[PDB]
Write a protein that binds this ligand. Structure first.
Ligand code: HEM
Length: 289
């Protein structure tokens, strides 16, 4: 199965920068969401979930076809809560109806990371909507109650190695878990992208507790949390080495996250040799906007 990127007709960098700006301006405007966390974290989570259905073995799933717009996928129990990100992107889709759905969902994640002071994430256009029957079945996204070997095996399906897995998981410094969405509750409620996930893993005093949905999670005295899959990154000695690296080098972490997140968003896509190069959007702050 081949999905060839096809640039939205006649569009170039400046068209997509306008879309980025509209997302970024709405991020700034709709500040109250989730007790003033704002929409950044849920848009990162949405970009990852729409990409994380990919299966390298047959090229099913993935961001290309924009299939999250179909009920089977937006109703996946693994996607509970992401409807808030979809609703946030709806007026953007209405203003720019030419951008494909996969391009919009993935650009939402890029814009959120950058506007939250994260790394620049190069982004390529050309995902093309595919029909409802191309929507992947539920059950391709990962469980949180599992250990390091589960995480490692899970991410082989996405063609990610240990460093890429540990880098991507640093997004769990953003936002929070919500009991009604996932059966987990807690988190830093942060909307600034940093390497704090790794520092918190190494430096907090963690206790394994049950939450009010009767699931186990790691809680710290200072009010942070880790899922069992997060904490597994310090139980496995190979992951632990990388956690220590990122806790000790914010620039390294930013560079490695940027590469892994672009790769995640592009898995499954064949780009023509004469496709445009990846775009690097300016933030609102770099534009004086
Ligand atoms: C083993 C892998 C992973 C598991 C099991 C996992 C699980 C979860 C769970 C259970 C939640 C809480 C959902 C809710 O209650 O609202 C969550 C939130 C989140 N996840 Fe992950 N996740 C994983 C990997 C990732 C990756 C790779 C990224 C992106 C790079 C990501 C980004 C996020 C973000 C940003 C949030 C916060 C959302 C918000 O505040 O609304 N996650 N994740």
């Amino acid at each position: 199965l081949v999905h060839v990127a096809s640039v939205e007709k006649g569009r170039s960098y400046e068209d997509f920068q306008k879309v980025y700006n509209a997302i970024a301006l709405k991020l700034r405007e709709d500040d109250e969401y989730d007790n003033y966390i704002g929409y950044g974290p849920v848009l990162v989570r949405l970009a990852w979930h729409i990409s994380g259905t990919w299966d390298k073995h047959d090229n099913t799933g993935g961001s290309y076809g924009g299939t999250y717009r179909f009920k089977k996928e937006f109703n996946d129990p693994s996607n509970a809560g992401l409807q808030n990100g979809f609703k946030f992107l709806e007026p953007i889709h209405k203003e720019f109806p030419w951008i494909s759905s996969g391009d919009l969902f993935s650009l939402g994640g890029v814009t959120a990371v950058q506007e939250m002071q994260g790394p620049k994430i190069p982004w390529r256009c050309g995902r093309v909507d595919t029909p409802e029957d191309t929507t992947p079945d539920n059950g391709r996204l990962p469980d949180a109650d599992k250990d390091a070997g589960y995480v490692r095996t899970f991410f082989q399906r996405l063609n990610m190695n240990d460093r890429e897995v540990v880098a991507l998981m640093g997004a769990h410094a953003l936002g929070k878990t919500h009991l009604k969405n996932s059966g987990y509750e807690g988190g830093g409620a942060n909307n600034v992208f940093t390497n704090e996930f790794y520092l918190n893993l190494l430096n907090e005093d963690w206790k394994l507790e049950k939450n009010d949905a009767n699931n186990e999670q790691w809680d710290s005295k200072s009010g942070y949390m880790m899922l069992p899959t997060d904490y597994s990154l310090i139980q496995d000695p190979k992951y632990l080495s990388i956690v220590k690296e990122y806790a000790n080098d914010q620039d390294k972490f930013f560079k490695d996250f940027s590469k892994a997140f672009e790769k995640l968003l592009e898995n499954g896509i064949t780009f023509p040799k004469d496709a445009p190069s990846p775009f690097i959007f300016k933030t609102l702050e770099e534009q004086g906007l």
